[model samples]
Target: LGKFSQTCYNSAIQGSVLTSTCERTNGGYNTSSIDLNSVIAAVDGSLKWQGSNFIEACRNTQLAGSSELAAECKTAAGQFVSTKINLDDHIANIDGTLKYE
Candidate 1:
């Protein structure tokens, strides 16, 4: 009886230690998510700035009477818009998955 009780006690102690370790590791999700969000926000801001610059270039080239240069700027601005939309969609998907999790 004494040996059986001691074995059970040791098993419980080991289980407790494992649970503590798991909790410590698993509890980092929030911090990691926040860090990832910060990076995404920074990237989004940078892309927005780039897109704005491209649009301004488009406008200026149109005014400067170079149809080819204006068309090139317009194409670049369209690419930026498409890329930004795709990035936003991906971010939304990630956010939805995180929320579901």
Candidate 2:
């Protein structure tokens, strides 16, 4: 659980850095003004880290038979999954726009 929390914290920090980088580079535009590759890489890294660290840790916690912690982990996992899908969609849209521009 401690390690899982750390991973979640790290993901949030990475996300903040990515958002700052994007805003500084493109003024948060939807155009090809930003480094789409970098954004995609960062998002993908977060997704992979969440899956390998956070989600896996949650599974371990569940296996330990702690119902409370397991429920909390379940909620966190759900949020992470939702966020990952949104990030994936954002990457796809950015790639499409960059291709046309």
Candidate 3:
């Protein structure tokens, strides 16, 4: 999660359209004027991390036996997607199918 979050932050900061007035989330900060593609790229990277972690965690028989880890992995992936959508919406500044909550 730490690396994923940092990567997202770096992408946001170095994005082509970044600005200085973006609002920060309690646990994370929204990228200022970030492009949709950059947001998607960051989220995609995060999803890869989550997927890799999930696979590694599942390798442990003890962890794989517990349903909680699987659920957590799914949630992590979902959160990455959700955060991506949120940033995309922010970049667009108008809603169609995506909205931040």
Candidate 4:
């Protein structure tokens, strides 16, 4: 679970066409253009800590008895892409999507 979640979360944040955003998640994460950078920095750290756990869990399950399920989780997680808005220096919002690998 940790690994899978981690992979998925990373995939969402550093997504291809659309990266993730921290504008409205907890009210306000950015204060200015520089603040947006802060959001980026925080995400790099905040998201993956527990992500390590998900990866471990995902593998543990595979080690247990659900090998295919673990891979399925990985595949699903990879597929679950992230596509929100961001502030390269003060970006905006519009629409989003859910992707996978």
Candidate scoring better on lDDT of 2 and 3: 3
Residue 16 alpha-carbon offset, candidate 2, angstroms: 9.6
Candidate 4 lDDT by residue in tens digits, 7-64: 1121222111223332333354322211122222112212121112232212211111
- Candidate 3 per-residue lDDT, tens place, 8-92, comes to 3233222222332233444334544322222333322232211123322121111112111111112434432222222322232
Candidate 1's C-alpha runs over 4 A off are: 1-32, 35-37, 40-80, 84-101
Assess the local accuracy of residue 96 in candidate 2 as a C-alpha lDDT between 0 and 100: 17
Question: Could you tell me the lDDT of residue 7 within candidate 3?
Answer: 27
lDDT of 1 by residue, 1-101 (tens): 11111111111111001001111223331111111122122122222221223333222211111101111223422432222211222221121121101
Ranking by lDDT: 3, 2, 4, 1
Worst 10 residues of 2 by lDDT: 63-72
TM-score of candidate 4 to 2 decimals? 0.14
TM-score, every prediction? 0.14, 0.15, 0.16, 0.14
The best candidate in terms of lDDT: 3
Task: Looking at model 3, report the run of 10 residues with the lowest lDDT sum.
Answer: 61-70
Clashing pairs in 3: none
- Of the candidates numbered 1 and 2, which has the greater TM-score value? 2
